[PDB]
A paper describes a structure:
We report biochemical properties and crystal structures of the LD-carboxypeptidases LdcB from Streptococcus pneumoniae, Bacillus anthracis, and Bacillus subtilis. The enzymes are active against bacterial cell wall tetrapeptides and adopt a zinc-carboxypeptidase fold characteristic of the LAS superfamily. LD-carboxypeptidases subsequently hydrolyze the L-Lys[A2pm]—D-Ala bond to release the tripeptide. The LdcB enzymes are single domain proteins comprising two subdomains separated by a V-shaped cleft.
The crystal structures of SpLdcB and Bacillus anthracis LdcB (BaLdcB) were solved by single wavelength anomalous dispersion (SAD); BsLdcB was solved by molecular replacement. Though the BaLdcB structure contains the same subdomain, it is less well structured in this region than BsLdcB and SpLdcB, and, as a consequence, the β1–β3 sheet is not formed. SpLdcB, BaLdcB, and BsLdcB share pairwise sequence identities of ∼30%, and they superimpose on ∼155 common Cα atoms with a root-mean-square deviation (rmsd) of 1.5 Å–1.8 Å. The active sites of SpLdcB, BaLdcB, and BsLdcB are, to all extents and purposes, indistinguishable. The cleft between subdomains is 15–18 Å wide at the top and 15 Å deep and narrows down to the base where a Zn2+ ion, added to the enzyme during purification, is located, which is coordinated in a tetrahedral manner by three amino acids.
Residue numbers in the entry:
A (entry chain A): 55 to 141, 150 to 243
B (entry chain B): -2 to 0, 55 to 141, 150 to 243
């Protein structure tokens, strides 16, 4: 239990993770996924996986069907991905939130389960925006906050931070702002 | 003209110069019985009937040689392409109407050895190399072969196969692009 293993840890362009960093409590959440089988991207840290299950349940109660697309991604994966674009998700290895195991990309069939801006205009994307905090999630890179987060709007990308999500949502803040960074 | 002639033909040529009608969606779209890299039935699950049955034959020929291919994305409508283009301007270069995926004759394929991704790395796999040399056996061509950018308008896409039927073998053997084969 160190600073970067905190559920409230900030990982961004400025603040990176150790290169060997892999959470030790990875599990696959019991939710529908946009691909079949088990892959490393199926996993989240246990607390975040349980919260994702809760989130999908709450969505279902209101007729909203979400699908999980991509969770954990290792340092090594990020390295290869950074190269493939050195020729936005141009995060250097060790600087992607996905390596924390606290972040899941989610989408919906109405958006072809793809991670695109169109997801924002679906009832599912709209619901996610206003309800993610009910399960301790925030939309990590909200619209208009590019200069702060370093990322263009990603309506599909949710980060588990626990109880502070509700305050962050209510105050319309980024994680950076909440943490005085 | 900027409009593809014989737009519904199995041998139609659709590229940056020649576009499809904006309201064109093939009427014989079906889901080929093959493994996919994604779950569920979506627009990209489909190919025109003749191309779908050809893809099945292709995957079966592959399997007999221990080659496991996965289908990644087939049909893409004009309307889908329109938002993808807009949200990438604010290769993914194809303007709406000018992607071959709208014909229903085109399937992006990959393999687990390339993590089912549509990248150059597919070319370095046993599966990608097999596909390069065998696609024509089921009526498919590698639409954007290496070095032909000046003609096709696209960099090497080892993952992107286009069904054209019988002429594939000739196109393959002669090392020609579809544009050249059709005098376009
Ligand atoms: Cl992402
Ligand atoms: Cl493509
Ligand atoms: Zn993400
Ligand atoms: Zn393609």
């Amino acid at each position: 239990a160190s600073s970067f293993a905190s559920v409230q840890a900030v990982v961004n362009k400025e603040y990176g993770l150790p290169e060997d960093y892999k959470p030790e409590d990875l599990v696959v959440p019991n939710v529908p996924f946009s691909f079949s089988g088990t892959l490393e991207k199926s996993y989240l840290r246990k607390e975040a996986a349980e919260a994702l299950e809760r989130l999908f349940d709450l969505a279902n109660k209101e007729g909203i069907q979400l699908n999980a697309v991509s969770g954990f991604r290792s340092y090594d994966y990020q390295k290869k991905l950074y190269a493939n674009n050195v020729k936005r998700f141009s995060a250097k290895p060790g600087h992607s939130e996905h390596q924390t195991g606290l972040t899941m990309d989610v989408s919906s069939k109405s958006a072809n389960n793809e991670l695109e801006l169109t997801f924002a205009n679906t009832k599912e994307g709209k619901w996610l925006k206003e309800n993610a905090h009910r399960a301790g999630f925030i939309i990590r890179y909200p619209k208009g906050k590019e200069s702060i987060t370093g990322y263009a709007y990603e309506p599909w990308h949710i980060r588990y931070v626990g109880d502070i999500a509700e305050s962050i949502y209510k105050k319309k803040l980024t994680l950076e702002e909440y943490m005085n960074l």
